[PDB]
Ligand binder design. Structure first.
Ligand SMILES: Cc1cc2c(cc1C)N1[C@H](O)C[C@@H](c3cccc(C(=O)N(C)C)c3)[C@]13C(=O)NC(=O)N=C3N2C[C@H](O)[C@H](O)[C@H](O)COP(=O)(O)OP(=O)(O)OC[C@H]1O[C@@H](n2cnc3c(N)ncnc32)[C@H](O)[C@@H]1O
Lengths: 666, 133
């Protein structure tokens, strides 16, 4: 889409309808006459367009009113309301832009941000862009959180997020214009190779893949058309659902051979009863022939009774000779059906032993996308975010996707090596209590109006708690934290000095010998300038390989590569890195997933901010003091860098609205 | 609304496999056993029909009798009359057969015979006697 309508779509907004949020800021216009709505909707779409067409400079209200034209630029307050709404919730003037209007001399309100991950940084920048005092507290010695980027020599490789999922509606699209990102398209072609190190032939590779996709659909049928979502008081997972579907396909295969051969016995037995009619008829024809013989040897001249007896016996034998001929037509027919039926046997198996192993690879990569073993994904809700998918090719980042968080951190107050350890929120404000990660002795106290928590969900999940909330988080929040799922994924960075793989493939698979190890080193990526291959450890395999060292893991990678390219063709790597995200205590995993017995609604619970009790009992209902963002807090686009980024912009708007007031709602 | 093509997922079937953890394998063992049973019951009858197939060697080609080709005259010799009366008593009312026996009278004359000479050959009685068997 192009024009002002493309701006709406590139901002994840319907161009022709007012959103639930815009209703809340403009409740006059939405209840108002349908014409004003179109005016408003144009003013919004146009302003989005202006921002989008150049996102390296601030879009001031004055600038916006200038490129508007009558009748739309008649009402200036409508334009000021719209511009400010957009500016507040980060639909314009977000990311890294040049300040037409430089900052206010004096800040208003003080807010602490736990975590310098993308979520964090994006809110931080917005709050500081709004003129608040912002400070970020970061346990790591670096920014970016789970967007990490190994760098040594001219070797570069993300240990963290590495894929941009398509620029059609993606806010990272704006950031890429703002920060140079060498963005390179992912060529989707992926050759699979088996254990022996030989490629799968295009016959299987397409047959199996198509079966996979068909199997997935099958579960959706089980889910939505048969309401197979609970089983023995527990919720059904995608894994179960897949097995049930596989078993029923293997059942139908047997059901099909049974009624096939039962069509054969029904015919063999029809033939058995036909032959006994034929033996017993032949034995009567044996006997009349003798009788007609015997009676034809009575040499004539005969009396008419013994003439009648020759003629009658002759009639009888030619009538029994007629029967036996018709019955041998009928045995010709039936003896031919058996030949055909035997020649058309139905399918021997559902899936061969090799077939099922290629299938496992399509499951592994499926588990690799969602970072968890399928046995955990909720069948009903695992693809709930599929509806908001972006358009366009998928991409990777040659210069290392750390360039973005680092870029965002410019200008911001960031305390690295600062492990937050207790969060204290009360009617009158908040205290954050951190230590120094190097000497855990040296203690820090931070006072502020509000705390924005971008602590990873794995950390919020931790028992016993790595961060203590005082007072405790209410049940409705802690329960949402147990229900949700925190996955795991890991990678192995292989740094060579030769390119020995096909430089035209971005990625190629390795098929695993069992179902139990389907995720163990199942996929490799040729992504970079340097000779770097990158190898995934997904599914159940992810958390198990974390209890093996680098060399051991590296040896298996060499092994698998040997198989596909020959023991000559692959040297020992110069530099090796292995990730352990479930091990890492500032992550405790890779990203969220929709666990069985969870739902999308928990992602909305994770965002609801916390409002403490009154200090003086009988005092008025205070302000909300504790705020949450991060990839686990954005129902529509979770487990993703953008989802983080957006949630950052979200809370920033919300906090500002709260401590700065929102004059645009009149 | 309908499952993918080549996917077989019926409501009846799913409880089927999901009543207990071993039920999925347990059913699929039933069908493996049903298959092998029918499978040998084929080679049983395959061999039973193999024996009966051998008893019928030579067909019935020794026992064939050449085709008698008679132009069909309409005069009635006495010989042809006596042949008739005997065929009646042995054949009831299968005129075709009776026509086959006499050999030069088609089936219509047999029926006309039955009434013209009905009094004199006492047909009625002969039929009761043929009805008695
Ligand atoms: C770990 C890991 C994460 C990601 C990826 C890989 C890995 C290894 N990649 C993978 O191929 C999967 C993939 C992807 C692509 C497309 C679609 C999907 C998808 O749809 N699915 C449903 C499958 C997935 C992708 C990728 O390619 N692009 C992508 O888009 N997404 C990927 N992802 C996720 C993002 O990486 C991640 O979601 C954002 O980074 C979130 O940022 P956040 O801001 O919420 O969270 P942080 O962790 O970043 O920040 C918190 C800060 O708090 C600090 N901290 C902790 N504890 C304390 C304490 N006590 N005191 C003080 N500070 C503390 C911490 O040290 C950090 O500094």
């Amino acid at each position: 889409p192009s024009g002002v309508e493309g701006a709406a779509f590139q901002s994840r907004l319907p161009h022709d309808r007012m959103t639930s949020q815009e209703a809340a800021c403009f409740p006059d216009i939405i209840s108002g006459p349908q014409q004003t709505q179109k005016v408003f909707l144009f003013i919004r779409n146009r302003t989005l367009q202006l921002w989008l067409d150049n996102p390296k400079i601030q879009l001031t209200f004055e600038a916006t009113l200038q490129q508007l034209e009558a009748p739309y630029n008649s009402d200036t307050v409508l334009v000021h309301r719209v511009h400010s709404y957009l500016e507040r919730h980060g639909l314009i003037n977000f990311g890294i832009y040049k300040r037409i209007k430089p900052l206010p001399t004096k800040k208003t309100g003080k807010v602490i941000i736990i975590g310098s991950g993308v979520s964090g940084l994006a809110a931080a920048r917005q709050l500081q862009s709004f003129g608040m005092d912002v400070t970020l507290l970061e346990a790591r010695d670096r920014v970016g959180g789970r967007v990490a980027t190994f760098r040594k020599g001219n070797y570069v490789a993300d240990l963290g997020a590495m894929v941009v999922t398509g620029l059609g509606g993606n806010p990272m699209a704006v950031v890429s214009k703002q920060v140079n990102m060498e963005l390179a398209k992912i060529k989707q072609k992926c050759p699979l190779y088996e254990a022996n190190g030989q490629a799968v032939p295009k016959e299987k590779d397409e047959m199996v893949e198509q079966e996979f996709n068909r199997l997935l659909e099958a579960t959706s049928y089980l889910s939505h058309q048969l309401d197979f979502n609970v089983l023995n008081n527990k919720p059904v997972s995608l894994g179960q659902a897949l097995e049930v579907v596989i078993q029923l396909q293997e059942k139908h295969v047997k059901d099909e051979q049974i009624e096939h051969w039962k069509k054969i016995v029904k015919t063999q037995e029809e033939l058995k009863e036909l032959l006994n009619k034929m033996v017993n008829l032949k034995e009567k024809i044996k006997e009349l022939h003798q009788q007609y013989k015997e009676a034809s040897e009575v040499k004539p001249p005969r009396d008419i009774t013994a003439e009648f007896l020759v003629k009658s016996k002759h009639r009888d034998l030619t009538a029994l000779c007629k029967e036996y001929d018709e019955l041998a037509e009928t045995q010709g027919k039936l003896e031919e059906k058996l030949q055909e039926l035997e020649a058309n046997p139905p399918s021997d198996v559902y899936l061969s032993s090799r077939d099922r192993q290629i299938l496992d690879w399509h499951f592994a990569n499926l588990e690799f996308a969602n970072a968890t073993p399928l046995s955990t994904l909720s069948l009903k809700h695992w693809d709930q975010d599929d509806d908001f998918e972006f358009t366009g090719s998928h991409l990777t980042v040659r210069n290392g996707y750390s360039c973005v968080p680092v870029a965002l951190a410019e200008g911001l107050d960031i305390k690295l090596n600062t492990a937050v350890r207790q969060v204290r929120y009360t009617a009158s404000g908040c205290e954050v209590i951190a230590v120094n990660t190097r000497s855990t002795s040296q203690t820090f106290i931070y006072k502020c109006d509000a705390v924005l928590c971008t602590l990873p969900l794995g950390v919020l999940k931790q028992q016993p708690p790595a961060v203590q909330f005082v007072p405790p988080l209410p049940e409705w929040k802690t329960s949402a934290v147990q229900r949700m799922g925190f996955g795991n994924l890991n990678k192995v960075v292989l740094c060579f000095d030769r390119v020995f793989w096909d430089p035209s493939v971005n990625l190629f698979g390795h098929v695993g010998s069992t179902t139990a190890s389907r995720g163990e080193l199942f996929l490799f990526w040729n992504l970079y300038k340097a000779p770097i291959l990158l190898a995934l450890v997904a599914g159940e395999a992810a958390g198990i390989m974390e209890n093996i060292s680098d060399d051991v893991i590296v040896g298996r990678c060499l092994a698998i590569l040997k198989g596909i390219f020959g023991s000559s063709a692959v040297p020992q790597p110069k530099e090796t890195v292995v990730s352990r995200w479930r091990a890492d205590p500032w992550a405790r995993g890779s990203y969220s997933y929709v666990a069985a017995g969870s739902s999308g609604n928990d992602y909305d619970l994770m965002a609801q901010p916390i409002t403490p009790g009154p200090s003086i009992p009988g005092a008025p209902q205070p302000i909300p003091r504790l705020f949450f963002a991060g990839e686990h807090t954005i129902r529509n686009y979770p487990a993703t860098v953008h989802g983080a980024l957006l949630s950052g912009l979200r809370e920033a708007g919300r906090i500002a609205d709260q401590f700065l007031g929102a004059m645009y709602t009149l | 609304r309908k499952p993918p093509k080549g996917m077989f997922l019926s409501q009846e079937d799913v409880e089927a496999v999901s009543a207990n953890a071993t039920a999925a394998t347990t059913v699929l063992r039933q069908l493996d056993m049903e298959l092998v049973s029918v499978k040998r019951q084929i080679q049983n009858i395959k061999q039973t029909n193999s024996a009966l197939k051998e008893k019928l060697d030579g067909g019935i080609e020794p026992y064939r009798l050449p085709e008698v080709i008679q132009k069909c005259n309409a005069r009635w010799t006495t010989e042809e009359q006596l042949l008739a009366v005997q065929a009646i008593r042995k054949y009831g009312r299968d005129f075709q057969a009776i026509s086959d026996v006499i050999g030069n009278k088609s089936v219509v004359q047999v029926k006309n015979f039955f009434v013209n000479y009905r009094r004199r050959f006492n047909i009625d009685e002969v039929l009761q006697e043929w009805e008695a068997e």
